[PDB]
Amino acid sequence: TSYIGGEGHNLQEHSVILIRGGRVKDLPGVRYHTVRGALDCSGVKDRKQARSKYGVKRPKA
Amino acid sequence: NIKSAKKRAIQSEKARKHNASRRSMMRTFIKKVYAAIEAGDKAAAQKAFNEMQPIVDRQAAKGLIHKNKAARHKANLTAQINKLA
Amino acid sequence: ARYLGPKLKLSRREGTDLFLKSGVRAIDTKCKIEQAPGQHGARKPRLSDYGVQLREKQKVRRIYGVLERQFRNYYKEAARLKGNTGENLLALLEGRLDNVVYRMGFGATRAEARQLVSHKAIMVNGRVVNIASYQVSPNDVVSIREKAKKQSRVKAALELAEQREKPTWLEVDAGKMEGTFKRKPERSDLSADINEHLIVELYSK
Amino acid sequence: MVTIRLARHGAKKRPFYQVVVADSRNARNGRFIERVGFFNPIASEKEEGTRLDLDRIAHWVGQGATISDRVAALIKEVNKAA
Amino acid sequence: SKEKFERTKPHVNVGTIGHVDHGKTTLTAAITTVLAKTYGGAARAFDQIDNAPEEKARGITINTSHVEYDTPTRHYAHVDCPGHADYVKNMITGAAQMDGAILVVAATDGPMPQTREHILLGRQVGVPYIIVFLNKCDMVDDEELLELVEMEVRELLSQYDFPGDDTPIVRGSALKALEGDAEWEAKILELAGFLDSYIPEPERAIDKPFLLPIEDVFSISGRGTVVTGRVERGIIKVGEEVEIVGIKETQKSTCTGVEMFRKLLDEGRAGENVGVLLRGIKREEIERGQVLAKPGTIKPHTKFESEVYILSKDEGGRHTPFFKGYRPQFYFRTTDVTGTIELPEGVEMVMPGDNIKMVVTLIHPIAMDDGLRFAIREGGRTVGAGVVAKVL
RNA sequence: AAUUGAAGAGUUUGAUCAUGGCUCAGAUUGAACGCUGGCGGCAGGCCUAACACAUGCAAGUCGAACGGUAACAGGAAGAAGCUUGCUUCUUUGCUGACGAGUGGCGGACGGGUGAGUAAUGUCUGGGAAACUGCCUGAUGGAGGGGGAUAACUACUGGAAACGGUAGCUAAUACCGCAUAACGUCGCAAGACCAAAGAGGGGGACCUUCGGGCCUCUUGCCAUCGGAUGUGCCCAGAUGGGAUUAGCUAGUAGGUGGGGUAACGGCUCACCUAGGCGACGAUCCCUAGCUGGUCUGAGAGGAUGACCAGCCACACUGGAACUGAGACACGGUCCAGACUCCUACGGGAGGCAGCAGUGGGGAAUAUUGCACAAUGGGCGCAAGCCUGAUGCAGCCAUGCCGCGUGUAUGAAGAAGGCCUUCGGGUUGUAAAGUACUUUCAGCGGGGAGGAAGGGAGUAAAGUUAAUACCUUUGCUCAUUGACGUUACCCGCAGAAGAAGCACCGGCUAACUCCGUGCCAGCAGCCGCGGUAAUACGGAGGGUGCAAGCGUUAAUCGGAAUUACUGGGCGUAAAGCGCACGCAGGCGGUUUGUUAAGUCAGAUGUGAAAUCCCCGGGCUCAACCUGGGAACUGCAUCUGAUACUGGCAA
RNA sequence: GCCCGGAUAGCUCAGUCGGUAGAGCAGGGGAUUGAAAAUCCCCGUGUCCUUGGUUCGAUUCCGAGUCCGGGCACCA
Numbered sequence A: 001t002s003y004i005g006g007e008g009h010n011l012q013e014h015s016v017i018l019i020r021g022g023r024v025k026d027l028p029g030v031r032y033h034t035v036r037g038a039l040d041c042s043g044v045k046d047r048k049q050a051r052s053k054y055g056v057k058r059p060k061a
Numbered sequence B: 001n002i003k004s005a006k007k008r009a010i011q012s013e014k015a016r017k018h019n020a021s022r023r024s025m026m027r028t029f030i031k032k033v034y035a036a037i038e039a040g041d042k043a044a045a046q047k048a049f050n051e052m053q054p055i056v057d058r059q060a061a062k063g064l065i066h067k068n069k070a071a072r073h074k075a076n077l078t079a080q081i082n083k084l085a
Numbered sequence C: 001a002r003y004l005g006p007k008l009k010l011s012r013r014e015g016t017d018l019f020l021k022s023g024v025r026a027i028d029t030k031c032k033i034e035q036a037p038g039q040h041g042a043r044k045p046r047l048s049d050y051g052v053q054l055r056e057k058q059k060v061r062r063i064y065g066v067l068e069r070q071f072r073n074y075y076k077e078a079a080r081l082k083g084n085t086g087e088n089l090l091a092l093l094e095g096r097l098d099n100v101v102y103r104m105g106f107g108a109t110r111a112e113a114r115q116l117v118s119h120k121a122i123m124v125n126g127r128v129v130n131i132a133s134y135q136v137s138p139n140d141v142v143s144i145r146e147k148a149k150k151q152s153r154v155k156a157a158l159e160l161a162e163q164r165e166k167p168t169w170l171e172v173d174a175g176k177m178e179g180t181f182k183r184k185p186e187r188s189d190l191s192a193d194i195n196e197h198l199i200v201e202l203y204s205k
Numbered sequence D: 001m002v003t004i005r006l007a008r009h010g011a012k013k014r015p016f017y018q019v020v021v022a023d024s025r026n027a028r029n030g031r032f033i034e035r036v037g038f039f040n041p042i043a044s045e046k047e048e049g050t051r052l053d054l055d056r057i058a059h060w061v062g063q064g065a066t067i068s069d070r071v072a073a074l075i076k077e078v079n080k081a082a
Numbered sequence E: 001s002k003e004k005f006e007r008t009k010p011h012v013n014v015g016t017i018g019h020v021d022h023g024k025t026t027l028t029a030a031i032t033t034v035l036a037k038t039y040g041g042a043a044r045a046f047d048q049i050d051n052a053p054e055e056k057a058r059g060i061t062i063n064t065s066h067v068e069y070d071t072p073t074r075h076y077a078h079v080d081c082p083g084h085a086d087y088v089k090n091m092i093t094g095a096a097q098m099d100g101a102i103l104v105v106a107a108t109d110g111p112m113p114q115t116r117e118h119i120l121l122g123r124q125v126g127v128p129y130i131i132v133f134l135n136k137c138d139m140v141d142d143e144e145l146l147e148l149v150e151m152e153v154r155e156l157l158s159q160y161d162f163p164g165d166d167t168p169i170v171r172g173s174a175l176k177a178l179e180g181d182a183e184w185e186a187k188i189l190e191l192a193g194f195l196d197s198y199i200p201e202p203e204r205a206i207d208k209p210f211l212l213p214i215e216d217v218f219s220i221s222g223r224g225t226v227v228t229g230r231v232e233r234g235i236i237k238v239g240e241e242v243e244i245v246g247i248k249e250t251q252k253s254t255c256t257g258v259e260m261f262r263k264l265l266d267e268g269r270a271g272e273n274v275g276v277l278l279r280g281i282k283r284e285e286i287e288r289g290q291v292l293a294k295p296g297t298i299k300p301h302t303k304f305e306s307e308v309y310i311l312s313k314d315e316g317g318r319h320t321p322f323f324k325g326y327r328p329q330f331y332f333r334t335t336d337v338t339g340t341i342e343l344p345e346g347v348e349m350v351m352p353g354d355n356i357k358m359v360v361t362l363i364h365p366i367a368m369d370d371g372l373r374f375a376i377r378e379g380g381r382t383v384g385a386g387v388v389a390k391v392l
Numbered sequence F: 001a002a003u004u005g006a007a008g009a010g011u012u013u014g015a016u017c018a019u020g021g022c023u024c025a026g027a028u029u030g031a032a033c034g035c036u037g038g039c040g041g042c043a044g045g046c047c048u049a050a051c052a053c054a055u056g057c058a059a060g061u062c063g064a065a066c067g068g069u070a071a072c073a074g075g076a077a078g079a080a081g082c083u084u085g086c087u088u089c090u091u092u093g094c095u096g097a098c099g100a101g102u103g104g105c106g107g108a109c110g111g112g113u114g115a116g117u118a119a120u121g122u123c124u125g126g127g128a129a130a131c132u133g134c135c136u137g138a139u140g141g142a143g144g145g146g147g148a149u150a151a152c153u154a155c156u157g158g159a160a161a162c163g164g165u166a167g168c169u170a171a172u173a174c175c176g177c178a179u180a181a182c183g184u185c186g187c188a189a190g191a192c193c194a195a196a197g198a199g200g201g202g203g204a205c206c207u208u209c210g211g212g213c214c215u216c217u218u219g220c221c222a223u224c225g226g227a228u229g230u231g232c233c234c235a236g237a238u239g240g241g242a243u244u245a246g247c248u249a250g251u252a253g254g255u256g257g258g259g260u261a262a263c264g265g266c267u268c269a270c271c272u273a274g275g276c277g278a279c280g281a282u283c284c285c286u287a288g289c290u291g292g293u294c295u296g297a298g299a300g301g302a303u304g305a306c307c308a309g310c311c312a313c314a315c316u317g318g319a320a321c322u323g324a325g326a327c328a329c330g331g332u333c334c335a336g337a338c339u340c341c342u343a344c345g346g347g348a349g350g351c352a353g354c355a356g357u358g359g360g361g362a363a364u365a366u367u368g369c370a371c372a373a374u375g376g377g378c379g380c381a382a383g384c385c386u387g388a389u390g391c392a393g394c395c396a397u398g399c400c401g402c403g404u405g406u407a408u409g410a411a412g413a414a415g416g417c418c419u420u421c422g423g424g425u426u427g428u429a430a431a432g433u434a435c436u437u438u439c440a441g442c443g444g445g446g447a448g449g450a451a452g453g454g455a456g457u458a459a460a461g462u463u464a465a466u467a468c469c470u471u472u473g474c475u476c477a478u479u480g481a482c483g484u485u486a487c488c489c490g491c492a493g494a495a496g497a498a499g500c501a502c503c504g505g506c507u508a509a510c511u512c513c514g515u516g517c518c519a520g521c522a523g524c525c526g527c528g529g530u531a532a533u534a535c536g537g538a539g540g541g542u543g544c545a546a547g548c549g550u551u552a553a554u555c556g557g558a559a560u561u562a563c564u565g566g567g568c569g570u571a572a573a574g575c576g577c578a579c580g581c582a583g584g585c586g587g588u589u590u591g592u593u594a595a596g597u598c599a600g601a602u603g604u605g606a607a608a609u610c611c612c613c614g615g616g617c618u619c620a621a622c623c624u625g626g627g628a629a630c631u632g633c634a635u636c637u638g639a640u641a642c643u644g645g646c647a648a
Numbered sequence G: 001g002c003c004c005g006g007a008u009a010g011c012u013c014a015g016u017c018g019g020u021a022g023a024g025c026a027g028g029g030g031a032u033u034g035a036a037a038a039u040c041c042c043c044g045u046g047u048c049c050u051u052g053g054u055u056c057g058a059u060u061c062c063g064a065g066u067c068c069g070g071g072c073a074c075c076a
């Protein structure tokens, strides 16, 4: 199982994602994170800070 | 496989039948002496040894035998018959 | 590679007069020195042990305009060379080409001199060199390529060098824009107010 | 068959040949018995570019080490008379 | 790879269009057999074209078949397409290459609701020329039956922006023509003669920036992604890097090979039906409907000005009026995208047969042209026919 | 000249000191991911499916071995038209050359991958029972004949693949005979054993007018060497498991026969009954090994991708042949699996060669150019072949350098944010002004890698010879994939080139607004409950920079495996106690030995890399010279205090 | 290119052969509290995936698109 970081994910039943290492320490049983911005698990919506992680592109404007 | 040097097959495969023919007549003359040893023929084997001495030596010169095998025959086979002689 | 940012803001956080904007206006004066490195630069800094070393390293790098990866390589070299670790570091950082051009007076600021080096203008031993990371060997001479000689920037800047220290280990002819390098740089002859004692210890951890 | 040939070391566009004695049935840089000198082709006019330890070469030539053309011409570059 | 192609003869993007059970597949085998005596030899049979094992029992063109032939005049390429409703999209995207085409009319069939829109699609897809062959000639003893229906046929061309009255109309039987009957065989020989005539030499745009409509991609053994379709604009040489631009996440691809019906072509030009090898591109990062554009030549658009005609219920199209929010599929020569209808103030209810003006925000980007001919289709029948006004 | 080299912090507690884990601060990678992205240089580029593979190419070559000429171009006999020597054309192997074929050499190297293997391997040092094509030295030989065969014809099986039968002819193909020695056998006497000729030039002679003859080049054959490569034996070393403790029956040794190039249970017949094993055998699991790489103060720990040596496999399992050399990547034969063609009778096939394809997968390149250089192959040579190699393309993957401009400039503006609405801050920052043009972009020039070889000539050798042939000069035309080169020059305009993380402490750096145990952050402590520097956004700052961060992975820290360098009364930990085999250690005097020990030297420790001192790429990375070093091992000569040995 | 199933308030599903959409589990908003458990007072919060048609009226009848999953094709 993996924790889904971010604010407003768009997953569903199948939805192919990507995993990276790292536990969350507060959810007993979780040892992995999902990569927002990788495969079918798209990036977080409208973040202007720390967008290397969470996969949000630079602002068009 | 289709290679220009596929001749090396037919060049050697034909050379095999030529090589096996000579290596066979070699070993028949070797077993010719041992039959005399199995009969105790001290002089018949001597002639039989004198019969194949050039036979074991000519094959040694034709690239077939590395002459040491040819030597060990002339070595032990004589040592076989002169021991009884 | 070059910082290309506010060249007087650096003097505020460091709190040291580094001559980044030496030029025409001798004393900067338009920086509100020591009390405005940023917005909340009115506070008093305690500046811990890790803080004093890291500020000591950023003091030297901001002077010579050398970035970390390139600077770490000099510390790498300063270790293997004979003598004194922190002093061999200043032996390397002083023998830099653009550093010599600043010392020879060709260029008001250090960055300006780097541009004279960068644009095939500065020439050493009759061999045009563009790399500012060039290492000046002993018994060498430095000049300017004739196509770029005395064209409104080298002249005014050379006059300004006479309003400063005029270091020991080198001396220019200054009539034909002709420099001359002598014996290796000495720890006493240089700055002597910036310290490398805390720098050697920074890479130690 | 032993042979005295170059080895081609150095870098891209900047070759540096190692005149060395090795076995003919090896690579261009394979197992070699002993190296005897070097030859820098692009050391045109500077301090030093070529050395051939001619005595140890003579030890192998006596054995029958076949010298390659490029190496053979360079023995005539380091002439006994020039 | 097989015989590096020679740039010898002029070419016309020809093909076959019509309606189910007219004989388009069988007659196309006869055309290549009639021309087998003329120059070289094709004679690509009924099984050669309905290649799929399902396509022999199903007997229809559920997936198009392209075979080339060559007259002793110039070079051509024949595109067989269906005339059936549910499989009409195979024909729709395949329709766009046809500068000139062939329409098939059996004597016991005549005009159909599909036959009616196949013609409508033509000019809206970019096919302003159509040769008509009244096939199944040996079906009645009434030669005049062929004569009165042809009156409706020329009028079918007439009603949908085509001066179809001057189109050569030869009458033959392709069943007997392919079986070897020399009597019926000469008819198609006379129709091919009209193609080295009447419908002229096309104005090829090979002197423009490169553009190529994606007909379909293949997965060739040992080669990979072979995007197929004749070049729309300019010339392309093997080694000219471009970017595959359209509906999905566009990216640069280097054209590392092009061939024509497995005939090696070095530097392709606009118009020849050739396949294009794409360097390092998966059979996932590709789609039917996108287009191969020169490096950053045209960025696709969503919102655009549009001038659209809603077909009358009498013309077999949309049979009732509608509300703002209607969702049909917009076809931009190879495109299959559902457009969001946004009709401005002045009109809200558009009845069947209305000359109206409105704009559409598209679900995704696509290669837009300010004058892009396009037919508006809803599943079942052609509901619309218009053109793009301007990119917004 | 040649190790100048070592830092800690958070967290149990009301608080402290301990012990003791957990975590961070650094470096590094064959990396992937997100955002982003100007250039150049140099390296690297399928670690997962040793999974299956389309097409091209990756090994050929010699007419100076020979029979031939099916082609191509000259030539010759002739023929043909007409411009009767202008063209046309059948013959003609007569020359240059060259398919197909015999034959020689190469195909066992190079190139690729790491499945297997815990010893049949590797590293290291020795040893003796070995062979070694091509290269090279010396001594001798190098006579005389014969019978077949492919190519080629005729017929013919078969879809194809592949052939089948009878005649034809050669050879440096094959085979006897002669001849043999420092060769083999044998104590010896004796016995026995080999072969190939070609091409060039030629005065005189000699011509059955093919040639013999003179002479040079080169090859053939034998023995002894050397050099090199390989094979073999022995000692030490060479993963984790004892919850694997006993194992083995050609198994341990002997005798005799056979076998290999070489000794030997390597193989057999019989006999003896051992051998290995707690200083870890058998069995299990994992793994290519090493020089080295990364880290480390060092000792070590992990690891061994690139590069180089060795080993091993070549679709799977197995075998042998030819050959100097293989139990053979682009060889043979068998079987199996998987593919393809088929006329269904039967065949073809092997990318772990470079490219490339599908799939696997977090993930890794072009179906490029050239034999110009280096090397390999054959050949007298010229050359021909070479996906070796040399370069180019692709990717920021890494490392190094450079650039995105310089100086000046106070309405100390605007707009933003804070505010004690006083003001501060952004900030010399921007604009404005004067300058510069690196790299890109466009327009011109321009090194080095190229040495040779060929042609011709000259001279020196050789010889009968001013010829041939070998060597040393000279002259001419030149031989470059890279290459629209490196570099240089010139033109233009501030012109095309700054992001990314973090800001509670650890750890460098701040406030306000919005959200109120929600949303969310997190490497540990932990923040969030209506006034959050820890959430999200804004301004500001800090770090690093064409990279910045995240994840994984090794070392460090970690003296938390303590050899260097820790502990055991209560923190984890003294067998419940005793006797005692193996094993470890041993009081004191003397002698003698010199194995452990030390000193010296020798042999060796491959090169590269690490380190020291220099040279060359404008600099660096990088390349490279010499040296040191390789901490080791073996032998030899001494010392012999200390330990061990034998004796008193 | 094609053929089927899921696309029903947060989640899971019942409801149709036209008749003005539900349930369960959810979670939640107010009174006390430092804040909550607990107790009291009250609760559907829905584009039935989207869009359109056969009409007095469509979750439902018939289509078409997209997305998700699962099967076959086609091979310059």
Ligand SMILES: Nc1nc2c(ncn2[C@@H]2O[C@H](COP(=O)(O)OP(=O)(O)CP(=O)(O)O)[C@@H](O)[C@H]2O)c(=O)[nH]1
Binding pocket: E018, E019, E020, E021, E022, E023, E024, E025, E026, E027, E059, E060, E061, E062, E081, E082, E083, E084, E104, E135, E136, E137, E138, E139, E172, E173, E174, E175, E176
């Ligand atoms: N009497 C007659 N029968 C004919 C003639 N031509 C074809 N037929 C038959 O008509 C049938 C339809 O063949 P087909 O070629 O699939 O038609 P199509 O027009 O391609 C149909 P789709 O619209 O799906 O592509 C076959 O049975 C064919 O043999 C003709 O000239 N005369």
Ligand SMILES: *C(=O)[C@@H](N)Cc1ccccc1
Binding pocket: E066, E215, E216, E228, E229, E230, E259, E260, E261, E262, E273, E274, E275, G076
């Ligand atoms: C291959 O034949 C292409 N050159 C032509 C083509 C074939 C099929 C579909 C579309 C184009």
